[PDB]
Amino acid sequence: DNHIDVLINGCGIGGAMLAYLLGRQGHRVVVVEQARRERAINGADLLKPAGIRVVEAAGLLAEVTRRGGRVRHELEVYHDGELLRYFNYSSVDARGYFILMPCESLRRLVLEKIDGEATVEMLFETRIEAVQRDERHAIDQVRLNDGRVLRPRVVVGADGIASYVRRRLLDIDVERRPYPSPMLVGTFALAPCVAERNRLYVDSQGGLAYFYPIGFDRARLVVSFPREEARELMADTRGESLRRRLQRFVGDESAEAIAAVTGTSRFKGIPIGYLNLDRYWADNVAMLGDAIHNVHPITGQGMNLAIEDASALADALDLALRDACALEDALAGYQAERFPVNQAIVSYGHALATSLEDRQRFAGVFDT
Ligand SMILES: Cc1cc2nc3c(=O)[nH]c(=O)nc-3n(C[C@H](O)[C@H](O)[C@H](O)COP(=O)(O)OP(=O)(O)OC[C@H]3O[C@@H](n4cnc5c(N)ncnc54)[C@H](O)[C@@H]3O)c2cc1C
């Protein structure tokens, strides 16, 4: 009646994909999102092979490239201007390729599919107000800020790095530790060199610049420098100090990409955390994506891991909701499958970010 299978807090890329996968299975899903639907959150751009498998299982892979997603299989990494590593991800495995696809492009696609799933109801500009638990400490009722009351079998935090579900429903507090270098991303015209190949540049002074195409006709430039330097560089908004700083460690192959940086004003900061929560669930409440882990954005994997979590959670929840197994066993299974994968990328990110300056150490991180 007001009984539903799953109440998903947050309709980000993780939450959307979980809602679609559950809705495809005929589960009764309510998604609560505080923002308006059209609010575009720019975000990560990368899908790695495991994420691509989810997209492919959702029936979405063709539409990803039709909407500007790009299949790639190479990366060059430079340190102090010289090539350190070249990676061909498909040299052994034809499916080793990755995809560049803006988070918001993929989320809009998924939302279009949800629009046709009659068992899913998406509520925008809506928030959870209060919950009630039963004698077994499972949430049994949820009231929303519009006055709507629901009775869900399962509550999911897909609500991102400041997860309400984590903080308020599970009462978990997370220590922060900021990094000393921020990371910022800007969008520019696309140079032939960027269209050709992804190139990452780092230097012994702690500079980083990563150039890669996005969409049909744009390029990203992701940069990082120590905080005060980064501030000075972004202050000069016609961009001359940044172009010059890039020229110190970015060689001729990417000269046109550097010339494409006409200004600094549309650079955006990127969140940087370090987390992998030792529990992904309690009672009938589970979490995914940035609610449970924060990887250094140097890895590129924030969206990708949210999508991998979503798929594993949809599998585990489908089992529970079908009565193939007890919810606690299904949630325990979700955690065992995801935790080691998320942990490895969280460790890898931190190892990469802290080893920039040291050419040998940085190459060693790539290899291991
Ligand atoms: C500009 C930008 C650049 C980025 N670049 C990178 C990068 O280069 N590499 C990288 O690895 N990662 C990057 N990230 C991080 C990456 O986008 C995220 O890791 C990814 O989106 C996580 O997906 P998620 O579904 O878990 O959460 P999110 O995509 O954060 O989605 C959470 C959703 O929950 C909603 N929400 C939050 N609180 C509530 C509430 N109380 N009630 C209801 N709804 C709520 C939010 O509005 C949002 O829609 C970037 C992020 C930003 C914003």
Distances (CA, A) of 24 to 8, 113, 119, 216: 15, 9, 9, 30
Q: Is residue 172 helix, strand or coil?
A: coil
CA distance 23 to 21: 6
Beta carbons of 348 and 276 less than 8 angstroms apart: no
- State whether the beta carbon of 12 lies less than 6 angstroms from ligand 1: yes
SS3 158: coil
Question: Alpha-carbon distance 319 to 27, whole Å?
Answer: 11
Listed in sequence order, the residues at least 6 apart from 284 whose beta carbon sits closer than 8 Å to its beta carbon are: 138, 139, 152, 153, 154, 155, 327
Residue whose tokens read 């969008």:
187
Contact in structure between 288 and 309 (CB atoms under 8 Å): yes
Shortest-distance atom of ligand 1 to CA 161: 30
Tokens of 226: 């120590």
Query: Measured from the CB, is residue 295 less than 6 Å from ligand 1?
Result: yes
CA 296 / ligand 1 centre spacing (Å): 13
With a 6 A CB cut-off, is 31 part of the ligand 1 pocket? Answer: no
Report the C-alpha gap between 342 and 333 in whole angstroms: 15
Cβ of 271 closer than 6 Å to ligand 1, yes or no, is yes
Q: What is the spatial distance between Cα 80 and Cα 360, in angstroms, rounded to a whole number?
A: 12
What is the DSSP code (8-state) at residue 168? I
Evaluate: CB of 230 within 6 angstroms of ligand 1: no
Boundaries of CATH 3.30.9.10 in the chain?
A: 46-101+182-270
Q: Is the CB of 142 under 6 A from ligand 1?
A: no
Q: If one looks up domain 46-101+182-270 in CATH, what number appears?
A: 3.30.9.10
Strand partners, 132: 141
Whose C-alpha lies nearest to ligand 1, atom 13? 44
Q: Position 215: which residue type?
A: G
Given resolution (angstroms):
1.8
- Residue 115 and residue 111: Cα distance in Å, rounded? 6
Q: Give ranges for CATH 3.50.50.60 in the chain.
A: 1-40+102-170+275-368
- Token pair, residue 212, equals 């890669």
Q: How far apart are CA 214 and CA 269, in angstroms?
A: 18
Alpha carbon distance 309, 337 (integer Å): 9
Q: Which residues, 6 or more positions from 225, have their beta carbon under 8 angstroms from its beta carbon?
A: 181, 206, 207, 208, 233, 245
Nearest CA to ligand 1 atom 30: 160
Q: Which residue has the tokens 């959307």?
A: 16
Superfamily of domain 1-40+102-170+275-368: FAD/NAD(P)-binding domain (3.50.50.60)
**Method for this entry:** X-ray
* Residue minimizing CA distance to atom 53 of ligand 1: 43
Collapsing DSSP states into helix, strand and coil, what is residue 287? strand
**CA–CA gap between residue 236 and residue 246 (Å, rounded):** 14
From edge to edge, which strands make up the β-sheet containing 218-224?
82-88, 74-79, 199-202, 208-214, 218-224, 183-189, 268-269
CA distance 64 to 47: 11
